[PDB]
């Protein structure tokens, strides 16, 4: 028998549950978050706000819609009734 070891590549961070949390056409309350992220994969739009964690929340109640800032750049927005 032999003896070996020392992998030193055996860890990783805790998974942080990013991505969208509400869907297009879905009704939303005030203050609800929509898209956890890091930096801006997506920007805010109308009646939507960004936080210190680059997270997107609805300032009001309404319905969600995702769109594009012209080219190669996305957006969300809340539109009320």
């Amino acid at each position: 028998k032999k003896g070996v070891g020392s992998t030193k590549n055996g860890r990783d961070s805790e998974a942080k549950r990013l991505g969208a949390k509400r869907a297009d056409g879905q009704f939303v309350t005030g203050g609800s978050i929509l898209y956890r992220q890091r930096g801006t994969k997506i920007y805010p739009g109308e009646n939507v706000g960004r936080g210190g964690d680059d997270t997107l929340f609805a300032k009001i109640d309404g319905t969600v819609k995702f769109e594009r800032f012209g080219r190669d750049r996305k957006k969300v927005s809340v539109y009320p009734v």
Partner: peptide, 10 residues
């Protein structure tokens, strides 16, 4: 290497 158990890294 030869005659070695499994594991303990690639």
């Amino acid at each position: 290497p030869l005659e070695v158990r499994m594991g303990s890294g690639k």
